[PDB]
Amino acid sequence: GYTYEDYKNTAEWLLSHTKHRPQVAIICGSGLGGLTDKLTQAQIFDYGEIPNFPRSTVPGHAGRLVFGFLNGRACVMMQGRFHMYEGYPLWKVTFPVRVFHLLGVDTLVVTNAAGGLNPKFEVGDIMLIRDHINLPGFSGQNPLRGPNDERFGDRFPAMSDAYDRTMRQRALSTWKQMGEQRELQEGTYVMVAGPSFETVAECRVLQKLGADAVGMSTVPEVIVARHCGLRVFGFSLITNKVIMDYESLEKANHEEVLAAGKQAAQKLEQFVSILMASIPLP
Ligand SMILES: O=c1[nH]cnc2c(Sc3ccc(Br)cc3/C=C/P(=O)(O)O)c[nH]c12
């Protein structure tokens, strides 16, 4: 793992190298990377340049912290996030969330792409996360596993209240405020480890357990954020409808996820920029 002083060192280094003092951390899901373009007084740090900071395994598109202002909120954005299917243990995946805390961040916005399990959902829909099912966590893949540091939080923190009530209201409001043809979905995100896509039998399992969307991220970051006392809001871009019957002759693919990512780009960047106004000042 990391010692408390590895995080302190990373935080202080970043404070020594930017005048930016962020209040909101935003983790961009696959196809919301553009959102760093909306920042003003943007200062970029490649992960490779930051002490202790896991480096990306995707040489094609690498990973950056961008400090800057979004809609008059002091932000730090992660463009390129870590997943456990890449081989990172969860203490590396969620390492940034503890750095954010020590930078003085008090709010985390997490976005992801996800497959629709709720049949009412359509490709392009945004689902606000009311709740999650942490399948890896049940089995021992929980990012708080190991010694607990009281300087971060309690041994046994609650997650029943993980996704801020207030921010979810203010999000539904903001959505009405802009009108929009399709309605804003709300529901349960189930994390699976991946990286392979679900069988029909697996899809039926996740439906039966009461999940509306399934993806391979987000939940560990949420747990570590909550363990710190960060306010947490997030959502899923529904990129694909999960094949739930053997009669179907369609299959889930990387391309159709990326393509949905490119389509609903503006809408999500637009939505997240306006939501900054709805985040309390410190
Ligand atoms: O049907 C599905 N089952 C299980 N998982 C998924 C995901 S998750 C994903 C799949 C492909 C690419 Br390309 C990117 C990501 C997200 C990455 P993230 O950082 O946004 O979470 C999308 N659809 C499904």
Write a brief structural summary.
With 282 residues, this protein is of the alpha/beta class.
Structural class: alpha/beta
In whole angstroms, how far apart are the ends? Answer: 31 Å
**DSSP strand (E) fraction?**
15-25%
Which distinct ligands sit in these coordinates?
the ligand O=c1[nH]cnc2c(Sc3ccc(Br)cc3/C=C/P(=O)(O)O)c[nH]c12
Number of domains as seen in the coordinates: 1
Order of strands across the biggest sheet? 5-8-7-6-9
What count of helical segments does DSSP give?
9
Number of strands: 9
Q: What's the helix-strand series?
A: HEEEEHHEEHHEHEHEHH
CA-atom Rg in angstroms: 18 Å
Q: Major β-sheet, in short? A: 5 strands, mixed, barrel
Coarse shape: globular
Helix content: 25-40%
PDB class: transferase
Keywords: PNP-inhibitor complex, transferase
Assembly: monomeric
Entry title: human purine nucleoside phosphorylase in complex with JS-379
Describe the structure.
The chain is an alpha/beta fold and 282 residues long. It has one domain (1-282). It is 29% helix and 23% strand. It is built from nine helices and nine strands. The chain has helices at residues 4-15, 90-93, 95-103, 135-139, 165-177, 200-208, 219-228, 254-263, 265-275, and strands at residues 24-28, 40-46, 64-70, 73-79, 107-116, 126-134, 185-191, 213-215, 231-241. It has a five-stranded mixed beta barrel. Strand 7, helix 6 (200-208) and strand 8 form a beta-alpha-beta unit. Helix 1 (4-15) packs across helix 3 (95-103). It is globular, with a radius of gyration of 18 Å. The structure holds the ligand O=c1[nH]cnc2c(Sc3ccc(Br)cc3/C=C/P(=O)(O)O)c[nH]c12. The site of ligand JSI has 22 residues, from strand 5, strand 8, strand 9 and helix 8.
